[PDB]
Amino acid sequence: PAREFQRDLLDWFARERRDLPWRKDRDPYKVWVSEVMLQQTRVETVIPYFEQFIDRFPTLEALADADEDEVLKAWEGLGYYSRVRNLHAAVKEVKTRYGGKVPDDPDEFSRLKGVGPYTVGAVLSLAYGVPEPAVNGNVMRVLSRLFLVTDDIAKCSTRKRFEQIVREIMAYENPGAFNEALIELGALVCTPRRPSCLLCPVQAYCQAFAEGVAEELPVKMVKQVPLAVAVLADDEGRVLIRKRDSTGLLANLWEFPSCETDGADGKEKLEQMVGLQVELTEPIVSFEHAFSHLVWQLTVFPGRLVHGGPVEEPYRLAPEDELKAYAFPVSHQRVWREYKEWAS
DNA sequence: AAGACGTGGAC
DNA sequence: GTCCAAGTCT
Ligand code: SF4
Ligand SMILES: [Ca+2]
16 A cells, blocks of 8 residues: 555645754755754754754854864763764765765765764655665654564664565655655654554554554663762862763763772772872762763762873863863763852 | 663653 | 663674
8 A cells, every 4th residue: 555655644744744943944964963963862852952053053064164072062961972973074074075065875875974774864865855764763663563563673683674664665756755754653643652543644554553552562672880070170260171082981072080980989089090189078969870871870079279280181271161161971060060059 | 783872851 | 760762883
């Protein structure tokens, strides 16, 4: 019923599509940015970030020419920062190697950093009309119900099957709207919980509904870490911060010098990292910060700084009124907030 | 394959 | 507490 189905989906879409910021046009650059921001992130959260992001970097050229620090700052608080570092580099690549024109060939576009099987399909089909499937968790949730599939969507290979299913039923006469319509359905109707099957435009074609299992689909299958953090201030008002390693957790983001005490190292633990010297005091407070794969149990230690040498390594000395210029993980934003209300 | 990789918000 | 939401990389 490919053609019939395609009609009920696309029709519902034409009359129900939300007017979101990135839907004002089909500009490749803007679709690409939005698609990256939306990955594992709530639309309500992305909206403000996209509008601020595009206002700051209006075109692919603007983003390519910006310093990663300014870009990380624009991404501050969105999470999975590796997404923007991949995007930045891909945009630089497009500019220099492709003449600032986003490749419209899957094989060419897919080679860019951050562009996986979903993003190639999403960006090329919405912005160029290239008939490629754009399968992500949303699309897999929808198709697993329409075609009652019990394959764990967490399995690497499961996606390939759903992509096959899309190549099969896709409306080649307008893939962009077909791909985008599947996502809207998953977002507005066929939701994770309580899918609104009774008002669904493609209910007639749904196997999961016929069997009354729509709500059990799709089928889908952390370490605790004590962290010691020190807020160091000059007899003048400056504080010590540093730029995290360029690989791994919160890469290239700034933070207050910290140390994984993986136990009860304590104030002395951070002290050992003084090897430029200073001393600390009692812990201002302790709180937890969760990640997808771990939970940081942080403890903040106030301390005074006394200049006895240069400031090298990743370290950097910054005036209180200059901190708002660096991108800090949310956990360190609270560290500093705690510090400020403590002293105040 | 399976685990790294953030965050604010419904239940 | 749980489970996230329009994945990608290794
Ligand atoms: S009927 Fe229900 S489960 Fe089936 S596609 Fe519509 S909303 Fe999804
Ligand atoms: Ca790729």
